[PDB]
Design a binder for this molecule. Structure first.
Ligand code: ZN
Ligand code: ZN
Lengths: 212, 136, 713, 50, 248, 149, 108
DNA sequence: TGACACGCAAATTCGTC
DNA sequence: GACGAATTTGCGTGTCTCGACACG
RNA sequence: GUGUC
């Protein structure tokens, strides 16, 4: 077991609460890691922190060499029979779902030249593209052509209780992004301090597994 | 032709026209020799040793960690006395990015994108050494 | 030559002194009247009327007393079992509860309120026949060699036979008259027994449950659960070349029908669903807590359920195209049922009936009253409980339609022909199948059972394997909780399934964690997980009756902690050698270092049928190899109680062994120490019983040398 | 019927009633037929069964 | 005899692992005289009894041969023009199996098959390469029809008798004598006997209904006497011919 | 499949040769051998099974099937295609069977005990179904068999 | 094969357009041009030619014995051993085979 | 929990106005 | 080109599923 | 329902 003494690498770890309160991890399981979403222009962004509900809408090109306008105008008439402020569909809707409300273990890690910075995460989120604009379209078309227990509608009204927040987007290149990177990178305590937490394994094992 | 029909089984290549696992020690070694700066998603054990539970929120700011790389072994985390082992799991193949949401007074807010994450590590305490110390 | 310890034959008596043969029949009942009887009281805790929300009663604490009899007028004297056996009486003790009820405006707390009686076992904790001495056993006119474990109702000895059933909260994949089909049976503590099945025909999967009119496509169920985009659906199913050629047709017939939104799938299902409130909410609440109730849903999230259905579909796909099929003959899945939980169900149903009908006794009196205050203890009854208990025990008709069950032939009169017929009936086990000629697998001796059920012990006639007997060394595990287990598994580094998508579960390195038919998450390098869990179990923090196994063909680890599993102790060895040495057993021979501290010193351990699947056991100590993990204590414990009377069983043939173990209970002889006092219907006795010259160690273990049923000639 | 344990049990019982001690006949062990037959000679009877 | 007839397939050996029902189930099947039987076994004799490669040639005649069994690789092309499916028929795999299958044979087979296709969009490009063009009509688009056309091309047989499943040749020897007997596992006796290779006069079947409808009623009373006697001689029992003749 | 039968003929040779060499080792007054020569109750198979070796215990006319995963008993190795491991017993009745050999021997004893319990049902059913159709067929006085009509 | 759209996430079906065939779908506007060549290679498992069954080579597997047959005066004999229960009590039966110019099968 | 003989019924093809 | 007539095939439902004796 | 043939 003594063959572990010569080769010993040292790595320092820092933690900061500067950006811990304002931090949300977005997940995109539908998209391959090769492609990116920060390159496509974003028109709007919407959040409710009360229930950790994020609604995004992406802006795509209207008339590019890869576009069939015949289907586009048909879907436009279907949704028309307002959602879109143009003649065709140029926006995509992504809805979220709150996952692992008790997020204390998960923390983001940044590796600079020789130091590691770990920032606690507030919540982890999963972004998924929703298709509800066809639901309302078909429902309205059918409307035109034709004419104590805890349920789900109570929680729907509970969701409706809160107001909504609108957000601006900042992406690849911006002084703000580098500012936030420095604020999450800057440790402040550059000196090597000691006596922060002492807990022998005979105490940590007893704290982990309660005899009661 | 950037937008191409992606594949579910070959989501890693997704070639369609014209998997290798690595250890955390080697991974951090080649991440360091390139002198790059990327973000990592790490999972920590519940109820860390401290001063009831103790997470990073009920903790301090500064240097509270020490990583150790042993020859012909693994990567081993220390907080002075407690000993943990860290390793990689569920290598992600999809897109994962973290942004900073900023809330103003009522509605006006700034949302800035920081970066993406492409590696998930998990760290946990090895109960073997704990039992060896408690028994002896 | 290898160091051999010729001492491990004294571990077995010390182990049977703690528990074993018939002590588990008393353990199941002593644990039920101390743990579950108050769990049922806490379940049905508050009940009130609807006339005006002012009247209510509360259940504080419930307990039972000692066996007492109510004579002419307030005469409660301690009665002995023999007195009840001669007077055609019934051995029972009252149940005194401390409830509170509000009459008028003030609250009344009446302590020691009797609500009924309940039978008590002969050698239970509340009975008088415990912790006594043979001199005092002769004072009460009772045989000290009587093992007990029966019920005395109307002057007859009734014993409840152990009944085996199939495992719940699990997925089975078996083949039928045309092809292969997967099924899932769901039944938790709350009364909800469901049986869903997914079938394959014309390369199209269909889900069948008795609540739906006809088949519903699996992709429709997926889109209704919440997963909308068809890409992540196949991602969760599996990313492989051969699994897509079988999943494409269903996707395209799903695209055929105009269903692309959650509302479309919900309306489709609600139109399909028949039941004797809109269609959307009907389909939503039907997918919520009707199909699979063993997977709880926190708010309305169907993600755990859809990943469960996806891994089920993957198991069916991997079963499809191959000859890998699941059978019901495996005993690692079959569970046993004692008399404890049956009495639990009976008692909870009687208690719910008594609470719900008395709720209607004071519901027709409040408006049609005569004064300002209503007394409820005078509107109280104590005959339905006693009547129901006695009827269920003596009659034998376990009929609970609140539980949707009808069972006959559960209790039987204790055989008092000889001393072996009485003990051998206590270890008799009944099967769930009925006595028919179609069965050949379950009747056939299975290679799975090893040291748990006696092979030779079986009646020859019509039932040729439906009735089985237990082995000498085996233990029935009771039920536990899973809090600390899940906590330690989460701290070990297991991953949350809600974060990673469907693509990573197709990875060969990824392993899934199963706990009592529940997906905890994903774990990598399962060897360290299994090793650490085994070390923690050997330590003493976690209870010893928790099974853990791993299967590589489907790459899943199972963690079993349900009650009703078979457990027998095994000696642990470390890399060439048994941990138990001569100095460890010399202290046992001295009088210290008994079985419990042997288990606390990490020298022996219990293994189940599914956990010994991934373990190597050595017969003797000369056959110990480098991959052997455990060592069987003795090889002669495989024989049962009736087969332990045959000299040189290996010399004899199995038909002769079966004939002799069947005839051993019909042989007439002495019954016990008090045969002149007891008055039974028919009794056969001998004049001068002799002692067997060529005796067996099993004879000495049961002390058959005190009551022999034969003669030397 | 193919029952060989009967003759072994008879032999062991005879040797026991002659010597004066009970002989063990447990499964997968007990006593052999090599040390018992040589003990049946000390008394004066035939060695196996005759 | 039937009460002492309760063990399964007796002649246990690796020589011939043919799942043949013989015992109380076969006697029960004979007594019930059911139309649909289990374990179909048909014995046939060849005209050329010494020539063995000839028996191999006739063995490939009476046997269901599928198209995917011959097809080495199939393709679905996609181009700016209208797409089609292209199957590459292998010639050597027919050669060592000695089939009478050419490209025109497969074309005519698919042209008279159950799947909806007629000789308007099927051609033979070269030697053993066939092309089929998916049309746009009568249920839905051509893409959904392409998924239905790729799953039944292997199902479409190229030669043989469809309900005939498996055939094996048995070598029966003597002092200096050698014979090759054809064992066909099917039911259509009139079709397996009405061929060139096997001798049509000397060929027997196992199903009573098949020999009843093909040969006749008087010829079905003889195959039921030999069937019962063949089940009693492998058990070591002894019955007289008259007891069976009276029941027949 | 070829390996299953290539070693199955190697085990029966040992038993046959042992039984054949045992016949030259026995006396002319051996009571079991005398009864075998007479043929009253016994055969040479029982003699060779009681003296030389039992042989191999076959189940469903084949080897013992696996019972946990790819192995019959947990005492053996995984994917262990060995004769003495799978289903071959070596000790005779006089010598004494081992627990694994005793289990493999009692496995075949339950094969016949469940078979003699089921035969009675369908046998009696086929008997009472066969009698009800042929019970009035009689021979007349002119050498002719007729029915009631 | 299996192809999905990157924008919406649903699958695509190919159908004719205006000037050339197109990769279309019925959930979101997204069309990809069909160019010089698109094709995939499949390899169905080809059939094997099976073995000839029967003959003395197959009988070479099971061991024979040395015992005369009272039909043609030959020591040539194959023996078979089987278990079956008779009317009184089980007894092992044996089958007899003649390895000669006649080659008949009996059960004693 | 196997056996197939009865009805009951819908997809489909030759035929003639 | 369009309507009445007769064929083949998936699917619905009913009956048992050996004998004898003794005891509670 | 149990026990034997
Ligand atoms: Zn699309
Ligand atoms: Zn001959």
């Amino acid at each position: 077991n003594e063959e572990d003494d010569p080769v010993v690498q040292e790595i320092d770890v820092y933690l900061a609460k500067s950006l811990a309160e304002k931090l949300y991890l977005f997940q995109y399981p539908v998209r391959p890691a090769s492609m990116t979403y920060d390159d496509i222009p974003h028109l709007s962004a919407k959040i409710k922190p009360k229930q950790q509900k994020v609604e995004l809408e992406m802006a795509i090109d209207t008339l590019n060499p890869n576009y069939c306008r015949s289907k586009g105008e048909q879907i436009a008439l279907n949704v028309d029979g307002s959602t879109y402020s143009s003649k065709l569909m140029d926006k995509q809707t992504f809805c979220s779902s709150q996952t692992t409300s008790n997020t204390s273990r998960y923390a983001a890690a940044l590796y600079r030249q020789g130091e590691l910075h770990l920032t606690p995460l507030h919540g982890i989120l999963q972004l998924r593209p929703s298709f509800s604009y066809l639901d309302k379209a078909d429902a309205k078309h059918r409307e035109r052509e034709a004419a104590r227990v805890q349920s789900y509608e109570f929680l729907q009204k509970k969701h409706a209780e809160e107001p909504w927040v609108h957000l601006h987007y900042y992406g690849l290149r911006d002084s703000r992004s580098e500012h936030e990177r420095q604020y999450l990178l800057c440790p402040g305590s550059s000196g090597v301090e000691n006596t922060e937490l002492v807990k022998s394994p005979s105490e940590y094992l007893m704290m982990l597994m309660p005899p009661s | 032709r950037r937008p191409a029909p992606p594949l579910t089984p070959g989501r890693l290549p997704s070639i369609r026209s014209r998997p290798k696992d690595v250890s955390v020690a080697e991974l951090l070694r080649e991440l360091s020799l390139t002198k790059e700066e990327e973000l990592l998603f790490l999972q920590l054990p519940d109820t860390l040793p401290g001063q009831n539970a103790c997470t990073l929120a009920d903790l301090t700011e500064g240097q509270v960690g020490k990583l150790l790389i042993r020859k012909s072994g693994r990567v081993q985390l220390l907080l002075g006395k407690v000993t943990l082992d860290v390793t990689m799991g569920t290598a992600c193949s999809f897109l994962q990015e973290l942004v900073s949401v900023g809330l103003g007074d009522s509605r006006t807010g700034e949302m800035t994108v920081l970066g993406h994450v492409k590696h998930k590590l998990v760290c946990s305490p090895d109960f073997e050494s704990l039992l060896d110390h408690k028994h002896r | 030559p290898i160091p051999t310890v010729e001492e491990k034959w004294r571990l077995l008596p010390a182990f049977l002194k703690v528990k074993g043969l018939v002590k588990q029949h008393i353990d199941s009942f002593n644990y039920f009247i101390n743990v579950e009887i108050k769990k049922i009281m806490k379940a049905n805790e508050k009940v009130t009327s609807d006339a005006d929300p002012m009247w209510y009663l509360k259940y504080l604490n419930i307990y039972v007393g000692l066996p007492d009899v109510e004579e002419s007028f307030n005469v409660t004297r301690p009665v002995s079992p023999h007195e009840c056996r001669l007077r055609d009486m019934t051995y029972s003790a009252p149940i005194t509860v401390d409830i509170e009820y509000t009459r008028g405006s003030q609250r009344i707390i009446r302590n020691a309120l009797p609500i009924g009686r309940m039978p008590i076992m002969l050698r239970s904790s509340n009975c008088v026949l415990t912790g006594k001495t043979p001199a005092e056993f002769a004072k009460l006119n009772e045989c000290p060699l009587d093992p007990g474990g029966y019920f005395i109702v109307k002057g007859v000895e009734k014993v409840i036979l152990i009944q085996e059933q199939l495992s719940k909260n699990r997925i089975i994949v078996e083949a039928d008259r045309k092809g292969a089909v997967g099924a899932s049976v769901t039944s938790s503590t709350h009364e909800k027994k469901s049986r869903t099945n997914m079938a394959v025909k014309q390369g199209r999967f269909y889900l069948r449950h008795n609540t739906l009119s006809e088949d519903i496509p699996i992709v429709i169920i997926f889109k209704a659960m919440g997963v909308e985009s068809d890409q992540e659906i196949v991602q969760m199913i599996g990313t492989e070349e051969h699994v897509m050629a079988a999943f494409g047709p269903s996707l395209e017939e799903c695209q055929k029908a105009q269903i692309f939104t959650q509302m479309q799938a919900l309306k489709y299902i609600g139109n399909k669903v028949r039941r004797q409130k809109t269609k959307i909410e009907e389909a939503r609440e039907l997918l919520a807590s009707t199909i699979l109730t063993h997977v709880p849903v926190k708010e309305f999230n169907f993600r755990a359920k859809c990943i469960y259905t996806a891994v089920m579909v993957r198991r069916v796909i991997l079963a499809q195209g191959d000859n890998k099929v699941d059978d019901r003959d495996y005993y690692g899945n079959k569970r046993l049922e004692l008399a404890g939980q049956l009495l639990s169900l009976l008692f909870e149903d009687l208690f719910k009936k008594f609470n719900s009908e008395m709720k209607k006794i004071a519901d027709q009196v409040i408006p049609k009253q005569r004064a300002a205050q209503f007394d409820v203890v005078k509107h109280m009854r104590q005959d339905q409980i006693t009547n129901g208990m006695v009827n269920a025990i003596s009659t034998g008709n376990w009929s609970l339609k609140r539980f949707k069950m009808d069972r006959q032939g559960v209790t039987q009169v204790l055989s008092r022909l000889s001393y072996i017929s009485a003990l051998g009936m206590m270890t008799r086990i009944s099967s769930q199948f009925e006595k028919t000629r179609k069965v050949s697998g379950p009747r056939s001796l299975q290679p799975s059972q090893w040291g748990m059920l006696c092979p030779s012990d079986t009646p020859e006639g019509e039932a040729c394997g439906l009735v089985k007997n237990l082995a000498l060394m085996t233990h029935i595990t009771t039920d536990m909780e899973d809090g600390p287990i899940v906590k330690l598994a989460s701290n070990l580094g297991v991953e949350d399934v809600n974060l990673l998508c469907g693509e990573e579960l197709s990875y060969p390195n990824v392993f899934l964690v199963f706990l009592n038919g529940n997906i905890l998450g994903v774990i990598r390098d399962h060897k360290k997980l299994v090793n650490t869990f085994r070390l923690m179990r050997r330590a003493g923090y976690i209870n010893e009756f928790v099974s853990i196994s791993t299967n590589l063909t489907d790459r899943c680890v199972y963690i079993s902690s349900d009650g009703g599993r078979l457990c027998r102790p095994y000696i642990i060895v470390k890399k060439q050698k048994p941990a138990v040495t001569n100095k460890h057993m010399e202290e046992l021979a001295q009088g210290y270092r008994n079985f419990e501290d042997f288990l606390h010193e990490s020298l022996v351990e219990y293994l189940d049928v599914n956990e010994e699947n991934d373990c190597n056991i050595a017969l003797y100590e000369h056959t110990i190899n480098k991959d052997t993990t455990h060592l069987e204590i003795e090889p002669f414990t495989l024989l049962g109680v009736c087969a332990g009377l045959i000299p040189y069983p290996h010399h004899n043939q199995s038909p002769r062994n079966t004939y002799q173990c069947a005839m051993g209970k019909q042989a007439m002889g002495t019954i016990g120490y008090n045969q002149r006092n007891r008055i039974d219907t028919l009794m056969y006795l001998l004049a001068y019983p002799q002692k067997p010259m060529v005796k067996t160690k099993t004879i000495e273990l049961i002390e058959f040398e005190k009551l022999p049923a034969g003669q030397n000639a | 019927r193919m029952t060989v344990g009967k003759l072994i049990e008879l032999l062991a019982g005879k040797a026991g009633v002659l010597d004066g001690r009970f002989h063990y006949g447990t499964a997968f062990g007990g006593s052999k037929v090599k040390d018992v037959c040589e003990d049946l000679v000390r008394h004066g009877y035939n060695y196996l069964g005759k | 005899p039937g009460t002492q007839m309760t063990l399964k397939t007796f002649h246990f050996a690796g020589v011939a692992s043919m799942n043949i029902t013989l015992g109380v189930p076969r006697i029960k099947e004979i007594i019930n005289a059911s139309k649909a039987i289990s374990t179909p076994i048909i014995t046939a004799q060849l005209d050329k009894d010494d020539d063995a490669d000839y028996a191999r040639l006739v063995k490939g005649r009476i046997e269901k041969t599928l198209l995917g069994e011959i097809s080495e690789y199939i393709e679905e092309v996609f181009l700016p023009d209208d797409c089609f499916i292209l199957v590459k028929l292998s010639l050597e795999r027919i050669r060592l199996l000695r089939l009478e299958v050419n490209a025109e044979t497969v074309r005519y087979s698919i042209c008279t098959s159950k799947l909806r296709v007629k000789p308007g969009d099927v051609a033979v490009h070269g030697e053993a390469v066939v092309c089929v063009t998916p049309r746009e009509n009568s249920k839905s688009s051509m893409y959904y029809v392409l998924q239905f056309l790729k799953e039944d091309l292997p199902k479409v047989v190229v030669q043989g008798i469809p309900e005939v499943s498996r055939a094996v040749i048995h070598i029966d020897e003597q002092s200096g004598k050698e014979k090759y007997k054809l064992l066909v596992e099917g039911d259509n006796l009139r079709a397996v006997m009405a061929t060139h290779g096997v001798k049509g006069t000397r060929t027997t079947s196992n199903n009573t209904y098949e020999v009843e409808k093909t040969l006749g009623i008087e010829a079905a009373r003889t195959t039921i006497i030999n069937e019962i006697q063949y089940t009693m001689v492998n058990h070591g029992m002894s019955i007289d011919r008259r007891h069976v003749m009276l029941l027949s | 499949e070829t390996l299953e039968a290539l070693i199955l003929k190697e085990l029966s040779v040992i038993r046959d040769h042992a039984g054949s060499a045992c016949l030259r080792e026995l006396d002319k007054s051996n009571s079991p051998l005398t009864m075998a020569l007479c043929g009253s109750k016994g055969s040479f198979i029982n003699i060779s099974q009681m003296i030389a070796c039992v042989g191999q215990q076959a189940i469903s006319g084949s080897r013992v099937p696996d019972g946990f995963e790819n192995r019959s008993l947990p005492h053996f190795e995984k994917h262990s295609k060995l004769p003495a491991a799978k289903g071959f017993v070596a000790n005779s009745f006089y010598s004494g069977l081992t627990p694994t050999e005793f289990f493999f021997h009692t496995m075949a004893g339950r094969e016949g005990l469940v078979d003699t319990a089921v035969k009675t049902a369908e046998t009696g059913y086929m008997q009472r179904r066969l009698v009800k159709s042929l019970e009035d067929l009689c021979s007349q006085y002119d050498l002719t068999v007729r029915s009631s009509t | 094969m299996l192809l999905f759209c990157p924008g919406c996430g649903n699958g695509l079906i190919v159908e004719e357009g205006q000037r050339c065939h197109r990769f279309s779908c019925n959930t979101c506007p997204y069309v990809h041009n069909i160019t010089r060549k698109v094709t995939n290679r499949k390899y169905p498992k080809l059939k094997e030619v099976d073995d000839v069954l029967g003959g003395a080579a197959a009988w070479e597997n099971v061991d024979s014995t040395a015992e005369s047959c009272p039909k043609c005066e030959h020591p040539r004999a194959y023996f078979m051993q089987l278990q079956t229960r008779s009317a009184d009590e089980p007894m092992t039966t044996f089958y007899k085979c003649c390895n000669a110019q006649c080659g008949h099968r009996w059960r004693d």
